[PDB]
């Protein structure tokens, strides 16, 4: 399950997430064995080039993607766990469906084939409503 | 009641920034499909949706003389020049001695205008050695040159004297990479994360001081960053009123910036056709010689509508009464250097030094009709140059190429930079005059509204609530 | 109103907080379009120079700024959300005031103006005083 | 106490952690004071080589290790603060020894080296066997 | 890292410097010259071996064909005599030249 772990699943792969999250920000693993301080064996010329700055800026852009992801997560106030649900349901705008049969006949990709017309709706609606609607404190029912 | 100190996040906060803004451009700079037109380093394209949001009921002091954007700006410009100069081959063998003839088989040798540009006709053509692709072989090739880029030597004072380049005896020279252009492109400097740019939208706002009509912005508007001495070309307009600015308006050395609300069709032009000859020196060394032009060859000159100049002068002198009701005189710069004495700019690669001497010949002391009623179109002499040492640094020099064809530079002027006289009287008669040694003010003359600011989203305030407590 | 739209508002500025943080680290949206990978317009030589590398450095420095922010928020127990309660009452050093005039008669700018020096103190309090004396849970009452 | 205040301690060491962290992660103020923009006093050529780009790369790699640390904190639900227990009981792989004398006479390394691999395997176990076994709710007694 | 960064900084500082490729051209040095002292305070096989010579050679202006003679001073450590010929005949050559750039 390095990058696999779901041949055809919608609910079984709902708990296999940790294996791939372990490697989401693991750019250092392959990098540790580089010995790139300036040289490896005795000596060399500068030799860091379009290749080097390409891998460097690639690591930068990947890290930037991840940072934007965690920013989006934090905005939702739902960062306490990967599998976190919502206080609002989805508008029944697709075809009238069935949870069971929908959870059997797709490799977590067919659901995404009817969302380009519904991505921003979900995204902005949750990001605004589920975020702003958190008041501060409770008043009456406590220890005292 | 109690001042329980609570923290908040997500509200603007303003502090001075020291960071970098980035490229922007339209499809033309990348649809041209030349290696790089004149900012192009795989530069980011522009943002078609400038989110320039307006804010009110706030205020801030703004200054363009304390601004850091100009320093980084000219540093990045010099970087552009150097990076474009890397592919340019070296022209040290081009510095070799050259023997010239002044007169040639041209129909005209002294053109119709005479303003000390035809007396010093400054047109000659010279032969000289260059290397063949075989090192054992060299060959004499000939081209055309003026007298400004060279000087006489071996002073047998006048018998077919040889010449030498002005910049070779002190500095190095290299090709201009003729495949790259020299015209500007609409730029929009963009803000990275953690910063913003505030445009002062006050229509009445002069150079520095307090401004309130705020426009918070991420990316600037269309900029045309072209170099000009004494003048502002292809720039923005003055909204609502003629803009007059100066660092210390009492002090005289501080130059005076002028932004008009009315443009002029400045056509500095070489109509007579040009020539180009690509000649192989070595394996990569290919020189672009100025060939022998066919036909009538008149000296390149320039044109302006002096009538619009007169009416805009009426406007600005009606505005220039800082402490006055009627006194002004203009005088030309009594000395300096050609790089600062004239209105110098770049156009189609050629460095046009157009001579803005038509300003000072005027006495607008009290009345404006006497110089407004003579509505007349001005013709002036404008010199041409091939080489340059931008920003007065003596280092690597650029050799601009032939432009074969004709050269037109029709443009809109919008502003000026001047200086008041040094040893001037107290109230007898104020004098102004042109100055162009400060190449830096030309860039802040449009970013005067723009100020770069950091972003510290942290905020704090007291309230009566409190966080969780155990006992 | 993407980042500002608080001209004269302090109490009214206690509700439009999230519209600012939505676009805080979104310079990536301005950066992803660079197309500086090897070449954009036709072609380029190595041509990866002070502009690109120090743009990358500015990305790095803004990232480090907001990461040091996020970690000192976490020190404050403050990464949960923007509104961030504290157990810290202000020591009696400011002049007379009202709970609303401070919250009504400014635009989020006059506050940081007049609280320049004192601010540091509060940090260490919320950095230390709120943290060390925090305990785990209660003992006595429960569902049964 | 950047790293000091613990020669052989677990109580004082556990009390002197925040000082160590806030002194360790003060490198951003060193980075702000670089002032290497183009030129230091008079004039410089480019002068940006493997030295500087790999200064930034070392910044990236160390902070990436820290990014993985925050990833770990998000995995274990351990992102609240440093005071963060674990639902696992320590297996008997260790050899007989008393608790407070380990707190007082192992300086946190004489323990770690002996429990180094067991720290790694129990890291894996606390990552796998902890978060997957969180129930959803209880309906017997609630707010309503 | 210390020696690596040292050599790297020395390279980077070597870049802006000017070059001396045409300065490498052949030379002719006179040892005995217009000077009075030859025996310094110390005599340990270093004063008679005064290791000081005044030496001429050609150089080039910024142009190609323009060449002019010029003289300077050199020690014995920088150059070596071409004993390949019959004798010295005032014939010397730089060693850093005829090994590297
Ligand atoms: C740069 O310039 C010259 C031209 O090629 C070269 O420099 C060195 O030249 C010498 C001789 O020309 C090379 O060999 C050494 O010669 C020393 C003196 O010369 C005697 O020996 C030669 C035969 O080798 C005779 O022809 C000559 O008449 C002399 O009798 C010798 O002393 C060396 O041997 C030993 O001497 C020293 C000092 O006593 C001992 O400490 C050593 O153990 C050493 O073995 C040697 O024979 C010498 O090799 C050349 N240097 C180098 C680096 O090669 C350079 O070659 C030239 N640069 C390049 C790149 O070619
Ligand atoms: C371009 O050439 C024309 C002539 O072809 C110039 O006009 C002439 O300029 C001369 C010199 O200034 C005038 O002569 C002078 O007259 C004054 C008295 O006014 C006298 O004091 C001087 O000693 C000298 O003799 C001449 O009258 C004048 N002629 C005409 C028809 O204009 C013109 O000035 C030249 N262009 C420029 C920019 O100078
Ligand atoms: C640009 O506009 C500002 C107003 O927004 C002008 O402000 C100038 O402000 C000064 C001080 O507030 C006025 O008084 C002067 O103060 C200085 C000391 O600072 C003193 O030495 C002088 O004798 C004078 O009292 C000044 O009158 C005022 N200027 C004007 C024109 O009213 C600023 O001058 C404007 N700058 C330019 C270049 O137009
Ligand atoms: C300097 O440049 C400006 C603009 O770049 C020139 O303005 C334009 O000049 C042309 C002729 O050179 C005008 O076209 C002509 O207009 C007349 C009168 O309407 C008409 O009878 C002709 O058939 C021809 O269409 C053009 O209208 C004018 N632009 C505007 C907006 O009016 C200017 O002429 C240039 N000056 C010199 C001395 O080259
Ligand atoms: C600036 O504008 C002026 C006037 O618009 C240009 O002057 C041009 O001057 C030449 C001679 O120096 C004139 O050539 C002759 O013109 C007459 C009358 O048109 C014609 O019959 C002759 O056969 C001959 O072509 C030319 O006409 C005249 N241009 C105009 C539009 O009248 C001057 O070239 C412009 N450019 C500068 C100063 O760079
Ligand atoms: C830039 O343009 C100005 C004028 O627009 C030039 O200044 C003027 O140049 C002319 C020609 O050199 C001067 O005429 C002089 O007339 C006297 C009369 O005796 C004669 O003896 C001189 O030999 C000379 O021809 C004129 O006085 C002068 N100043 C004005 C009109 O105020 C200036 O030379 C131009 N500079 C460049 C670099 O093109
Ligand atoms: C623009 O020029 C006009 C004249 O073309 C100026 O108006 C008039 O100027 C004359 C002479 O300067 C004034 O004459 C005066 O007469 C009295 C005696 O009554 C004498 O004592 C004075 O020394 C002077 O010679 C005339 O009064 C004046 N008229 C007006 C209505 O102003 C005009 O002032 C000029 N523009 C400006 C802004 O000054
Ligand atoms: C502005 O330029 C136009 C041409 O582009 C000039 O047109 C004509 O210019 C002459 C003199 O240069 C004027 O002559 C005078 O006319 C007035 C009547 O307006 C008369 O009272 C005078 O005795 C003299 O004859 C001519 O009128 C004028 N054309 C028109 C239709 O007015 C014009 O003069 C230039 N204006 C100025 C102030 O220089
Ligand atoms: C100030 O802005 C104006 C407006 O764009 C510039 O005028 C235009 O300049 C461009 C070149 O910079 C001209 O295009 C060129 O035309 C030649 C003709 O052979 C062609 O070979 C080039 O590939 C290029 O297309 C354009 O014709 C010209 N006029 C317009 C747009 O009406 C002006 O050049 C700017 N100022 C300066 C000093 O350049
Ligand atoms: C540094 O100084 C030493 C000290 O002179 C140099 O080493 C050698 O020193 C011995 C002294 O025992 C010299 O020996 C001489 O031998 C002759 C003949 O037997 C004798 O008459 C003298 O009284 C003396 O003992 C020997 O010449 C000398 N070597 C040289 C090359 O001069 C050493 O060379 C010096 N190193 C440097 C880098 O200057
Ligand atoms: C200056 O230009 C003239 C242009 O005529 C050169 O002379 C021409 O040289 C070509 C080359 O073969 C001949 O075909 C023409 O017949 C020549 N014309 C005349 C009028 O002589 C002249 O050689 C050039 N001189 C220098 C020093 O560049
Ligand atoms: C921290 O406080 C000091 C002093 O309290 C501030 O110094 C101000 O300095 C100016 C000119 O020296 C005085 O006119 C002010 O009265 C001073 N402020 C006060 C409150 O007295 C200093 O600027 C403050 N630090 C920051 C970053 O604002
Ligand atoms: C939700 O669905 C209903 C019924 O199909 C439709 O009328 C409405 O426009 C939808 N709203 C959104 C935001 O999709
Ligand atoms: C301020 O900017 C607004 C743009 O929303 C404009 O309507 C208003 O006229 C401006 N006011 C001034 C004084 O510039
Ligand atoms: C330019 O501004 C002045 C005010 O200084 C005004 O009188 C003139 O009409 C304006 N001209 C325009 C907008 O063309
Ligand atoms: C401007 O300069 C004058 C003298 O040159 C001086 O008296 C005055 O104080 C200066 N004002 C400012 C604001 O620098
Ligand atoms: C001369 O000018 C004409 C423009 O009418 C141009 O077509 C021709 O090519 C030019 N002659 C050259 C470049 O030799
Ligand atoms: C302005 O008037 C003065 C008279 O004092 C005169 O000397 C000067 O030449 C006049 N200006 C011009 C441009 O002729
Ligand atoms: C100059 O201004 C005119 C109108 O005033 C405009 O049509 C033309 O495009 C402008 N040219 C420039 C900015 O180059
Ligand atoms: C400033 O404008 C009005 C009038 O002062 C005020 O009510 C408003 O809150 C302020 N902010 C704006 C217009 O953005
Ligand atoms: C707290 O307030 C008291 C009285 O207002 C003052 O004496 C003391 O210095 C203050 N201490 C701090 C840390 O602000
Ligand atoms: C050093 O301090 C005391 C005295 O030696 C000792 O008891 C303690 O264990 C040592 N280590 C520390 C304080 O870390
Ligand atoms: C640890 O050191 C303390 C103080 O010296 C001592 O009381 C205790 O017995 C020691 N425990 C060991 C060595 O296990
Ligand atoms: C000079 O030479 C003499 C004899 O050869 C010797 O005694 C003396 O020490 C030498 N001087 C020095 C400074 O070595």
From TrEMBL, chains A, C, D:
<feature type="glycosylation site" description="N-linked (GlcNAc...) asparagine">
    <location>
        <position position="91"/>
    </location>
</feature>
<feature type="disulfide bond">
    <location>
        <begin position="78"/>
        <end position="84"/>
    </location>
</feature>
<feature type="glycosylation site" description="N-linked (GlcNAc...) asparagine">
    <location>
        <position position="105"/>
    </location>
</feature>
<protein>
    <recommendedName>
        <fullName>Envelope glycoprotein gp160</fullName>
    </recommendedName>
</protein>
<feature type="transmembrane region" description="Helical">
    <location>
        <begin position="1"/>
        <end position="15"/>
    </location>
</feature>
<feature type="domain" description="Retroviral envelope protein GP41-like">
    <location>
        <begin position="10"/>
        <end position="144"/>
    </location>
</feature>
């Amino acid at each position: 399950g390095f990058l696999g772990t779901a041949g055809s699943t919608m609910g079984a792969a709902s708990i296999t997430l940790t294996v791939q999250v372990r490697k989401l920000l693991s750019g250092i693993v392959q990098q540790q064995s580089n010995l790139l301080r300036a040289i490896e064996a005795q000596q060399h010329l500068l030799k860091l080039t379009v290749w080097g700055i390409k891998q460097l800026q690639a690591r930068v852009l990947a890290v930037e993607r991840y940072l934007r992801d965690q920013q989006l997560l934090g905005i939702w106030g739902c960062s306490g766990k990967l599998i976190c649900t919502t206080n609002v349901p989805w508008n029944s705008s697709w075809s009238n469906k069935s949870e069971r049969e929908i959870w059997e006949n797709m490799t977590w990709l067919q659901w995404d084939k009817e969302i380009s017309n519904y991505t921003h709706i979900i995204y902005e609606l949750i990001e605004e409503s589920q975020k702003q609607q958190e008041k501060n404190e409770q008043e009456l029912l406590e220890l005292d | 009641e109690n001042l329980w100190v609570t923290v908040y996040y997500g509200v603007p906060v303003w502090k001075d920034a020291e960071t970098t803004l980035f490229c922007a451009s339209d499809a033309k700079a990348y649809d041209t499909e030349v290696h790089n037109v004149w900012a192009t380093h795989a530069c980011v394209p522009t943002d078609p949706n400038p989110q320039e949001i307006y804010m009110e009921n706030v205020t801030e002091e703004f200054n363009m003389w304390k601004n850091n954007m100009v320093e980084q700006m000219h540093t990045d410009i010099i970087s552009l020049w150097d990076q474009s100069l890397k592919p340019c081959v070296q022209l040290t063998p081009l510095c070799v001695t050259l023997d010239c003839s002044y007169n040639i088989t041209n129909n005209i040798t002294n053109s119709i205008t005479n303003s000390s540009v035809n007396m010093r006709e400054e047109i000659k053509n010279c032969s000289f050695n260059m290397t063949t692709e075989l090192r054992d072989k060299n060959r004499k090739v000939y081209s055309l040159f003026y007298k400004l880029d060279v000087v006489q030597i071996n002073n047998g004072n006048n018998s077919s004297n040889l010449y030498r380049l002005i910049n070779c005896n002190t500095s190095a020279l290299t090709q201009a990479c003729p495949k790259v252009t020299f015209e500007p492109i609409p730029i929009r400097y963009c803000a990275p994360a953690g910063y913003a740019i505030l445009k002062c939208n006050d229509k009445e706002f002069n150079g520095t001081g307090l401004c309130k009509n705020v426009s918070t912005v991420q990316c600037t508007h269309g900029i045309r960053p072209v170099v000009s001495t004494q003048l502002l070309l292809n720039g923005s307009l003055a909204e609502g009123k003629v803009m007059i600015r100066s660092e210390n308006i009492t002090n005289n050395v501080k130059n005076i910036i002028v932004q008009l609300n009315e443009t002029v069709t400045i056509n500095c032009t070489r109509p007579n056709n040009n020539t180009r000859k690509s000649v192989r020196i070595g394996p990569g060394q290919t020189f672009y010689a100025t060939g022998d032009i066919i036909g009538d060859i008149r000296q390149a000159h320039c044109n302006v509508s002096g009538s619009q100049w007169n009416r805009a002068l009426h406007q600005v002198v009606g505005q220039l009464r800082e402490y006055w009701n009627t006194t002004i005189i203009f005088k030309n710069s009594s000395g300096g250097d050609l790089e600062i004495t004239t209105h110098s700019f770049n156009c189609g690669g050629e460095f046009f030094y157009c001579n803005t001497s038509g300003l000072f010949n005027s006495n607008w002391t009290h009345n404006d009709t006497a110089s407004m009623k003579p509505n007349d179109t001005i013709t002036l002499p404008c010199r041409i140059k091939q080489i340059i040492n931008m920003w007065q640094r003596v280092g690597q020099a650029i050799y601009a190429p032939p432009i074969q064809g004709v050269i037109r530079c029709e443009s809109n002027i919008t502003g000026l930079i001047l200086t008041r006289d040094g040893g001037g009287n107290i109230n007898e008669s104020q004098i102004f005059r042109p100055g162009g040694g400060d190449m830096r003010d030309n860039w802040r003359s449009e970013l005067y509204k723009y100020k770069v600011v950091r972003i510290e989203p942290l905020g704090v305030a007291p309230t009566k609530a409190k966080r969780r407590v155990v006992e």
